[PDB]
């Protein structure tokens, strides 16, 4: 009941009460991360993945 | 001279492989902020080295 806010070892916000009615959790991590490109080969063809 | 045998077995533990890591330097740094990436951008491609 004391606590409000919630960080994590990396010291970022992992979870918080919600300050108006029906408290309940909070945000979590979206979708990142590095695209590949799988290339069979240009003298091959033109297709890639 | 010896006079009889003894087969024995010795261990020996090499490692070939370690943890296969990869760190987003665009969301460890700059995780969000659009300022901070314009700001990071101006440093060069660290990142992409």
């Given at each position: 009941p004391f606590q409000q806010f919630g960080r994590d070892v990396?010291?970022?916000?992992?979870?918080?009460?919600?300050?108006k009615t029906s408290?309940?959790?909070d945000i979590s991590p979206?979708?990142?991360?590095?695209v590949s490109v799988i290339t069979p080969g240009t003298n091959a063809s033109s297709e890639v993945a | 001279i010896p006079t009889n045998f003894s087969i024995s077995i010795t261990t020996e533990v090499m490692p070939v492989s370690m943890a296969?890591?990869?760190?987003?330097?665009?969301?460890?740094?700059?995780?969000?902020?659009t300022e901070c990436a314009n700001?990071?951008?101006q440093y060069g491609s660290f990142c992409t080295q």
């Amino acid at each position: 009941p004391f606590q409000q806010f919630g960080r994590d070892v990396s010291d970022f916000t992992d979870s918080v009460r919600d300050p108006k009615t029906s408290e309940i959790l909070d945000i979590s991590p979206c979708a990142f991360g590095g695209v590949s490109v799988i290339t069979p080969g240009t003298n091959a063809s033109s297709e890639v993945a | 001279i010896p006079t009889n045998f003894s087969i024995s077995i010795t261990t020996e533990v090499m490692p070939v492989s370690m943890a296969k890591t990869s760190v987003d330097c665009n969301m460890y740094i700059c995780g969000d902020s659009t300022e901070c990436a314009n700001l990071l951008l101006q440093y060069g491609s660290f990142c992409t080295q």
